[PDB]
Structures are given as C-alpha cells and as structure tokens.
Structure 1
C-alpha cells in the first residue's frame, strides 16, 4: 500500500546570496511546484517533515550588506501554503544537520560565527520547546545526519581545524554518543541519508576538491563500502529518499552552482539525471512527504 503524490521539497539555498525559494518536485509525473517563499532567506539550513508539516532549521542569511546566523525554526503547512515561525533554538546553527526520531526534531552541530558546535538539542512540536540533549564527542559543521533503527548518526563535517572522516551514533534512550567506524573519505557538507538499512554518504568536500564518490555504512558489518559515484562532483547538496531511490539536489562543485538532480537506483547501482532545478544553488534544505 504505497502512498501517492509525495513531494521532494527544496527550501532556501545559496546562489550569489542566500535564497528564500521553496519548490517541490514530484518524482512520479516529473513536475515542479512554486510554493510560498521563506520569510528570511537562508543557506546552510536543513529540512525535515514531521506529521504532514515541513520544517526549516538553522542556516545563515548571506547578503551583500552583511551576514546573520539563524537560530530560527519555521514550519510550512502544505494545506495553507504558509510559513509559520516556531520556537527558536538555544543557539544559531549554520551548516546544520537534522534527523527525526519519534516525532521529535534533532538539531545537530552547525556553527555560530566562530563557535563550531558539538551541542545537540531536541524539538517537541506538541509543546513548541527546544531542549538540550547529550553533546557530541566531536564538534561538527557541515554534518550529515541519518536516522536508522531509532538511532541518530552524525557523519563527517568540520571541527574548526580538521575536516572529518569520522562518525558517531546517538542513543536516545541512554542519552549518549559512541564513535563508529570512520569513513574511507574525509567529507564535509556531504549528503547523508538512509536506504535499505544502510547509511549513505554522497559527495562533500575533502579539503582539496568537491567529491562525486559515494559510500554506504552497513551497521552489522561495521564497514564503509564505495558504490557507484555520482555524475557531477558536489558539496553542500540536498539529499533524500523516495520509494527505494536516493535523490541528490543541487550543490557546489568549486566553481559552478548545480541545478542538476541525480537519482540513484540501488538495484542496478547506477546514477541517472532525472530533472533540473529552476536555477542552480547550494546549501539547500531537502525533505519528502512521509510514507505512512
């Protein structure tokens, strides 16, 4: 009983300045929707869907006349096509990673000016409150976050001095972090998601170049393995999964800003370009309408 009419949202991003675009792609018919724009333009933000509502978390408003790190949590309702402000986070978080467990949004890492966060906080939609949980073992900005077996995985990033290939796993019931096996490649701003019980890490920045390589983590073998690489090299990419296929949206390749949207098929182990965004951008917040 698969759900029909699910939409891959893309919120915010950067192209010469921070963007406020909210657009929705339908993978079935291949159409794009031009939805209500963000109140404040934002890049380096993260997107997630909880209970039929899209959330935009953290980021930064990069403009020609100054920069401002965001602690904002804004909620988009598809029925009304309207953004509504929620309770803001305890601290601003640019280049943030987020994950959802038991209907609560986890805000992981990110930066506030010079402060590279290892702190993590949890949002409860029912009472509109943020609360700090156990902090990470490593400071991480540009961190990719994945949820698997009711555990939160923080993958890659940048601690302020070193660019990270390491990763750690959070345990909500115990409230503690534990380091897992490090990746084969150093990655900051990589697209991290979960597909068929494996944590993927696509693209990112290794300190030298933007990456097109993709590797997945099998939790039982505790081993990172390379799969088919993407066509285009990209960091700060939006990522998500829809009906057994990973979708990577936009990004930055060291020179241009990508409008390309590649689609990974795990059965054949091949990437294919399915569509293009209305304009090239990086640092977007991406999510999908939930299954059921």
Structure 2
C-alpha cells in the first residue's frame, strides 16, 4: 500500500503534507513542513521522503520526512538556494538540478549522500534551467525543458554519473518550462508546462530505444507547475496553475489505453508542489 505524497505548494507558499491512497481514494493529512515552500521538489530514498529547495525567499533547504514516525528532520542545506528546482535519485543519492536564486538561473548541479548528510557539486548542465523537469532512467539523469533566463526551452540533456558529464539529447517537440517529468516503461514523459504563450495540456514522451519524442493523449486541464509521479503503472498529475486557476484536479494516465481520467481532487487547489511515492 504505497501512497502518493504531496508536499508544499502555492496558493503564499504552503506547509501541507498530504498522502493520497489510490486504492481507496482517501487523503491523509500528515505533519506540516517546518518551513512552507512552493517550487520545491520531492523524492524518496530508502523509504524516506525528501523536500528540496523552493521558495518560502529562495530556499537551499533539504528536509526529510519519515512516514513511520510522521516527523520531519532538517538536513544539510545545498550550496545555493534553488527555487523552481528539479531532483532525481541515482544510486541512493539525491541530485539537485538547476533552479533559480534571484537573478541567477542555475546550470549547477549537486549531489546529496544521506548516509553522511553531505552535498557535493558535480558537473553543471550544458544549459541553465529553472523550472526544469528531471527524471532518471537506467541510472542516467535527464534534465528536460525549463527557462534559461532569456529563452524558454524545448531542449533536454542527460547526465552520465560514471563520467560526470552532460550530453544534449533530442529536443522535445514543444517548449516547456514548469512541466511534469517522470519515467514509465523505458520512456521519459513531459506533461504540461508553459510554452511562453500558454499553459499546456499536451504530453510527449522520449523512447530511449528510438531517441524520439512522440505525443500521447493530452491532459484534460492545461497546467504548469504541476506535481507528477508514477504509481502502480500509471502517471498521476497533481494540481498546477492553468493560467487562471490554481487547480485541485488530479488526473491519471493509463498507458495501455492511452487515456487520462480524473481520479480525485486535492483538498485545496495549489501549484508548485513536490511529489513522491513510497
């Protein structure tokens, strides 16, 4: 019985930590973040949930939530504040990628070792990316889309840990900042985001076997700054801003039928959440 955890968000920055159970449709309210945050990222390592970066105002904080105790614990902060951050996990380490600090649009990347509570800088990305989506497939880390400070991006790049090097991959078919990015079945999905003119409902995926991006069925709601995760073989998108409204909608993508459906609503509409499953 794994749960979808949503941490933080915006409607000011929010402290909520809530867990959705897709099997019975219930939402459970859990211990608040010590410091409210939007534009943060969530991830899980060793069954512990981590909330990373965001804006409280730009945040360098890392905090760890233990589902077994229902408690948060502070961790070592990052080298720099990272609002609009993306995060990925490889080999039990958290990678914090991109984000912004005031006028700084980061290309820097750093890695956290939970066992010794230590961050270390690694190679910076080829492109500065705030509002970047991050996913990990076969122990490679992908940074997708974002905004470089001048141009909104359809480009994507891949980090090779054994070599501490970034390489551009095929660009998406759509410019997206603030997209939800995840991995399902050897494919990197990019859902929603902002193309510089509108929030998006389109969804595309990158097949590592073909090196090509292909559109799948669109979401019912346009959304940027959405939470996203995979649970029991399906993609879930949580909240976001549609250009007008802070959404409470949670949609769920079934890949076998290429269909989206509305499965629940968050307890209050919000954007800029961090999401993980454990």
TM-score of the alignment, normalized to the shorter chain, above 0.5: yes
Which ranges in structure 1 are unaligned for 5 or more consecutive residues? 61-66
Q: Per-residue CA shift, 1:105-146, capped at 9, x if unaligned?
A: 000000001100000000000000000000000000000000
> What secondary structure, in the 3-state scheme, does the structure 1 residue paired with 2:115 have?
coil
Q: CA deviation at 1:80?
A: 1.1
Give the aligned partner of residue 99 of structure 1. Answer: 88
CA distance in 2, matches of 1:141, 1:157: 5
CA distance in 2, matches of 1:111, 1:162: 14
Q: Per-residue CA shift, 1:163-211, capped at 9, x if unaligned?
A: 0000000000011000000000000000000001100000000000000
Q: CA deviation at 1:219?
A: 1.0
Counting only pairs closer than 5 Å after superposition, residues 1-292 of structure 1 correspond to structure 2 as 5-15=1-11, 17-60=12-55, 68-289=57-278
Q: CA deviation at 1:269?
A: 0.2
Q: CA deviation at 1:99?
A: 0.3
Q: CA deviation at 1:52?
A: 1.0
CA distance in 1, matches of 2:241, 2:41: 16
Q: CA deviation at 1:243?
A: 1.1
Q: Per-residue CA shift, 1:212-252, capped at 9, x if unaligned?
A: 00000011211100000000000000000011100000000
CA distance in 2, matches of 1:51, 1:30: 25
CA distance in 1, matches of 2:238, 2:164: 33
CA distance in 1, matches of 2:47, 2:203: 30
Q: Per-residue CA shift, 1:64-102, capped at 9, x if unaligned?
A: xxx610000000011111111000000000000000000
CA distance in 1, matches of 2:177, 2:21: 28
CA distance in 1, matches of 2:163, 2:153: 25
- When normalised by structure 1's length, the TM-score is 0.95
CA distance in 2, matches of 1:131, 1:27: 36
CA distance in 2, matches of 1:273, 1:158: 29
CA distance in 1, matches of 2:53, 2:4: 19
Q: Per-residue CA shift, 1:38-82, capped at 9, x if unaligned?
A: 01110000000100100000000xxxxxx6100000000111111
